């Protein structure tokens, strides 16, 4: 997952979970990538699927 094209003003949604380094399950890639941006690049991907 690359969050280069972020942030995005909106996301579709569908549920395809990712697990962030904050132990939070992100609903989809767009949600995850917007959060990485919001964290100013500190949040990272832990693994695919729910935490």
């Amino acid at each position: 997952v690359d969050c280069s094209e972020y942030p995005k003003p909106a996301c579709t949604x569908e549920y395809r979970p990712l697990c962030g380094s904050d132990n939070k399950t992100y609903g989809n890639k767009c949600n995850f990538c917007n959060a990485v941006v919001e964290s100013n690049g500190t949040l990272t991907l832990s693994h695919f699927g729910k935490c």
Partner: protein, 185 residues
């Protein structure tokens, strides 16, 4: 199964929009971004209860898709949860609406604008969208937007969340009904 219930494709989970029909043929509407590249649809994560197969998909530009029921025994309620739906209508600014989704359940709000353009990126732009102040979260895609017994739209996307509040865009359902020659019941 009814509007707002979970639906699974090979890729992920979305929500059923509305149960519709044409003659004696039953289908269900959902988001186009969910039907895009999906063939078979199941009622459970285990994929043991088949619903049907994708018959049409329109995304981006629009955001709607339709799935033909192949499962002959599953109840196909013309409702959203327990809310009966008897007709479809056009959204208006200031209209009080309600959304139901498989992740967040039922949330209400109002229509704040019409004909909005939403850019999901990568050339995925949708037009003519209904803007509202209703929240929605991943898994809620394709769920119904209704007002009383009237079907209004299909959940397409948004920002924010149900805790802090957010903005959600919906695809007018009237356009989908006409495109497929189907009707709610």
């Amino acid at each position: 199964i009814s509007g707002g219930d979970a639906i699974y494709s090979s890729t992920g989970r979305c929500s059923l929009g509305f149960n519709v029909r044409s003659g004696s043929t039953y289908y269900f509407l959902t988001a186009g971004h969910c039907t895009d590249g999906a063939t078979t649809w199941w009622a459970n994560s285990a994929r043991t209860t088949v619903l049907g197969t994708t018959s049409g998909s329109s995304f981006p530009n629009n955001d709607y898709g339709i799935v033909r029921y192949t499962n002959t025994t599953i109840p196909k309620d013309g409702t959203v949860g327990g809310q009966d739906i008897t007709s479809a209508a056009n959204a208006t600014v200031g209209m009080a609406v309600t959304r139901r989704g498989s992740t967040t359940g039922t949330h209400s709000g109002s229509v704040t604008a019409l004909n909005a353009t939403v850019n999901y990126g990568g050339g995925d732009v949708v037009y003519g969208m209904i803007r509202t102040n209703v929240c929605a979260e991943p898994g809620d895609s394709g769920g119904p937007l209704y007002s009383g017994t009237r079907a209004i739209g299909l959940t397409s996307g948004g920002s924010g969340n149900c805790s802090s509040g957010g903005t959600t865009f919906f695809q007018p359902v009237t356009e989908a009904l006409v495109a497929y020659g189907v009707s709610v019941y």
